Structures are given as structure tokens and as C-alpha cells.
Amino acid sequence: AVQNVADVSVLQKHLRKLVPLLLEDGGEAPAALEAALEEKSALEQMRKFLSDPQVHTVLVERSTLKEDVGDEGEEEKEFISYNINIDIHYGVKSNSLAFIKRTPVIDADKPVSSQLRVLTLSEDSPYETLHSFISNAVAPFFKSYIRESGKADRDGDKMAPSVEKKIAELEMGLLHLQQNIEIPEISLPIHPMITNVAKQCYERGEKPKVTDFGDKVEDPTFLNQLQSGVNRWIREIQKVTKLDRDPASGTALQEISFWLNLERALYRIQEKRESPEVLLTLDILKHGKRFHATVSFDTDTGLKQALETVNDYNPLMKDFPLNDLLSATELDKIRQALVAIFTHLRKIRNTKYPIQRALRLVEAISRDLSSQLLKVLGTRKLMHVAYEEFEKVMVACFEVFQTWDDEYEKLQVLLRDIVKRKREENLKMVWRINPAHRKLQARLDQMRKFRRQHEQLRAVIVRVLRPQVFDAADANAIEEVNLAYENVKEVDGLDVSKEGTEAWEAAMKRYDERIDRVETRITARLRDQLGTAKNANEM
């Protein structure tokens, strides 16, 4: 509610105590924060924040500014800059503190932090952070709240279980959170003056020596700064190398993009650390016996095992048929690409790859098929497709699907072969694969039945419905069956929704209502004409 408006001093001191540890493990309220924190621009801003019972967001940030300096001697100088914002946004190269007012107006007599929550911004990967931390902060908490409050006991409000289901849907739906950000390389996050000195000593083309650095080559502080920069670079490259997109919550296109991205990233970083600056830095830090930095650079590469994992280029041998399928618009070309990609999948046999990941790629290919063939059939215009051409394209797509099912069976055989390989380590043996295209194929093959029955009905209309070939019943029946055919022809088409299939089923049962009316008519005309004898027109 609306209460007394809190003062600047109490919350200012609270946040001043909160920032330094949470920002750089100390600092004790740095004066740079208080410079623009006490500024009238921030002062009236936070006054409006407290007083107005409508705003509940604010963003205080302290940016470690990468101040580019043009003076000869170094490249960049570390800087401190406090930022004040009322809207939350991703601060670049900084972590912010977001505050939400639990009460629309906050006061000092009641605990401010009781009526206001603290949120701290992530800069490394804000989306991954927010998603995973929200999951781990509300997903068990909300379940515990439901269990203790007995929401399952009171069935009058069955909507909290629905929001539990939807938050679960969120947490299992977006896992990538926009992975594959395509960060191939970064700059050199090491000591700047050594780099500039080496640049000046190499632009002359005279092989920058040990002595040209002066006393810095053996200065303990200089070597410590070199070690800190090397550690920062090794940590950044470790972070980018350990990036491995989760199989699920993506697509085969995402997989191939991630594969190419990691390949080019490792190619470029296996040629970047060999630059003369890095070599001379390592040589001159080791000159003062900085063995820890050397062993850190030797052991924390973290890419040699990734390079061995990526030695297999059969992934590309499957990616090429994947691009072929992406460009494929005809069924024959589609299952030609399927045969090719299965043949290449039999060639990943000799190489090494995570088996669960490869299986997930198999389902990814399966429902990517589902999608592209859905697009193809939408192109084919099954909305009002003629009967005979519908059957022809149906036979084509169904033999293509039978080829895909044979590929499915041969992939199961390859899975048995993998199990024969998996005897060497004997890990988990759980398997569950089912593409969603089967339901679409079910809808097609149930269109097949009414198409066949319609074709059977067309000739027999003229045959039996004609009187000995009554006329009024004949005319009524032909009108009804023709209009019913038109209605069931235009009611559903290339539509994929299974609820559309149920509507088609309703149309079919109405169609069969007319069909059974015709049956009653023709059977009545039958029996009244019977009883004569067995021969020919009689029976």
C-alpha cells in the first residue's frame, strides 16, 4: 500500500554496504559509486521510485570501464564508473543490482529489505543465468508450497497445478536460451604495456629480445600482472571451449551450426595463442620462474580433448544430405537424401560420438523431415486435390515413408551394433525414439479410406441408384450425395490438425448417415421387388 516515503540515507548506506563485496569482493563503498549515487539525477530518481506507487524497478550498476587510451606505452587502462538506471537492461562488461519494491510505497520504520528484494545482474550470460536460477529458485519452491498448502487437497481451484505445469513447460522448453552466440575469438586480455612494447620492438623488425623489456622482464609485479592476464585469457578460452549446446531444445540446423562454429573457433584459437606476443610473454614470465602460469597454459588448454572429439568429419557427411533435404522439394529427392544420410550414418560407425547425442540427432532429423514434408504437402495443395491425383501423390509419399521406415529399422540395427560397441563401457541402455510424423501419416491413410469408399460409391450410384438400370428418390439421393461429397471435399485438406481430422470424422459420420439412408432406400426397393424366383433380375 501507500505509506511513509523512506529517506535517502538509510537505503543509500544499505546499498553502499551491499555493493563492494558483491561486486569485487570488497571496496567498502567506493567513492565512485557515491559520486553519481548522491547526484541529483539519481536522487530525484530514487525519490520518485520510493514515493510513486507505480514503479518497482531500478538498476544501479558500476561498470569496470575499458577506457581506451591513445598514449604510447599501453593499450587500455582499467576504469571505474557507476551507472544509475530506472529500467533493467543488460549492462555491458558490468554486473548491476536490481531492486523491486514488494510494497508500492516503502518506508524506513519497517525494514526496507523486507518490503524490497535485491536482484543482481549477470554479465557472462544473463539469459542462461535468469532461466536456470529462476528454475532452481521457484520450481522446487512452488512445488513445496503446493504440497504444504494442500492445493491438491482442494480441487475447487485447479489452476495452481496448471501454472506449475506451465512453469515446468518453460523450464524444459527453453534450454538453449540462445546458445551458439557465435563468439569465435576475443581480444588479448593480458597486460597492455608488454604487448605495446613488443609491438614497438617488432615493427622495427629486429626480433624483440629479452633485454628490451628492461627490468620488467624480472620485475615481480610485472610478471604477476602477466600471470593475471594469462589466467584471465585461459579462463575465457576455457569458458568458450566448454560451451556445448545441449542436444534437446534445438534442431539439426542448430547442431550443424554449432559444429561448424566450434570447428572454426578451435581452428582460429589454435593459431591465435601462437602469436609472437603470447610466446614472448610466456618466455619472459618463465624467465622469473613463473612455473604456475606455464603449467596452467599447458594443462588448461581444454581443447585437445575437444579436438579429438571433433576429429570425426562424418558429421559433415551427414550435414551435406541435411542441406540436400533442406533444398529438397520433391519426394523422390527427399528419400534419396534419406538413403544418403543413412549411408553416411553407417559411416559414423568407426568414429567416436556421444551415443545419446547421436540418437537425439536421429529424432531431430526425423521431425525435421516431418516439418519439411508437411511444407511439401502444403505446397501440393491437398485442400481440393482431385481424387486420382490425390491417390497418386499419396502412393508416392507413402512409399517414401516406407523407405523412411526401412531406414528406421536399419537405424535400429545400427543401434544394436552400437550396443555391441557399448559393451566396452556398459553405460545406460535407455532408448525411446518416436517421430511425430506418424500421426500425420495416420491422418493421410484415413483420408485413403474415404477416398476409396467415394470411388466405390460413384459408379454404384449410376448402377443401383438408377431405377432398374424410383426416380424421385434417385434424384434426391444423387443430389444429397453430390452435396455431401462437395462438403467433405472442402471441409478438410492439407490441414495437419488432428482436431481437423475429428471434424473430418464428423463429416464422415454425416456422410455415412446419408449412405445408410441410401442403403435403406435400395434395400426397400430390393425387397418389394423380390419374391418372384431365383433367376437373373428376380434375385
Next chain:
Amino acid sequence: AVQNVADVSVLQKHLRKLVPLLLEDGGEAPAALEAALEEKSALEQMRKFLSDPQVHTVLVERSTLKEDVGDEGEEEKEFISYNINIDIHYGVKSNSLAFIKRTPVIDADKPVSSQLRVLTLSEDSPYETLHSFISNAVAPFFKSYIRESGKADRDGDKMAPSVEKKIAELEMGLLHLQQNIEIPEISLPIHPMITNVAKQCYERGEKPKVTDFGDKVEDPTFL
């Protein structure tokens, strides 16, 4: 990862100097925080949390206990206590602080506070709590980042508008969570002494009366 592990003392003292600034709005560490320091189970749990990278979540719950009273007409007092939670639970009348490692790897040289994400919660109503916090935490921030980072111009992931709609329906369903106060029936407190006397005099098979309490019926303090 486990290469360098922050010591128990440093992180424990950081929490000791951090908790009162939030759960008391700039106060000093109470006896509950002293018990938290001396709680061996809490010590082992925080050590496991800092060491094991399998779970990056830890929850400290400053519990409030229904302390028994013997005052002259004043109801039961509230006693501040502490609870340690490796996972997170639905706290009741018990303020909690959630600390989850923003940096999955653990390093003593790396700032532990800057290696951790700080969350907290107060016990008034979980519905509006979650709804308002998720709204004013993700919607402006996520919208600003997707608009300003060029992701809206990037066709690599149509995932973003879909999860925007998912967030919108999240907020809708969570704001709709305002139906029930959820207070059908609560236990009836009078006094432990009378209740246990009645139970012990009834389990033998006799009807409790005024005589069983004896002197307790005319004691002003007990009354």
C-alpha cells in the same frame, strides 16, 4: 569445478556480515546467526554446496519460532532462529535467503560473492511474490535485451518470441493466483500444561473436570 575452494571462515563471515543488512535492514548479527555459525549441519551443508558443482543452490532460512510464553495475558512470543537448506523449501513465517552460484566453477581467488547470485524471499503471499518478481525481473530486461542486441534482427532463433508469449501467459496465470487466503482451520493453542494434564487423565478412561487440575484452577499466573 574444484581447483581452489573458498574457505569456510571467509564465506561464513561474509554471510554473517551480509544477512543482518537484509533480514534486519542494516541490523547486527543476532543469536540466530551465531547458531548458524555454530550449526555443524549447516557448516557441512555449506561446505558441500561450495565444493560439489552438481548442485549450485543453497538456502539459509532465518526461521521465527512460536516461543512459549508465561506472561500475564500476553500471547506466545516469536523467537528468531536459523535453518539451513541445501535445496529450497516453502518457508512459513521464516525469512529465507537464496544463494546460487552465478559462476558454476568455484574458485577462492574468484570473488565468492561475485561467484554467487543473491536471492531472498519474505513470507506474506507466494502468489503475488512470484508474479511481481518474475514480471519486474524478466519482462523489461528480456525485452530490452532482445530488442537492443540485434536478436530481433537475427533469424537464427524464433525461440525468443515464443518464450515471450510463454512469459506473458506466465504473468497472466500468476496474477490470476489471488483466489484463496488458504486459512480453513488452524490449531487452537491454550497451554501445554492443561492439554497434557487432560490427555493423561483421559487416556486412563475418565472424564476431565475442574478437579484434575487441582491448584491450577486458582493460580493467577497459570490462568
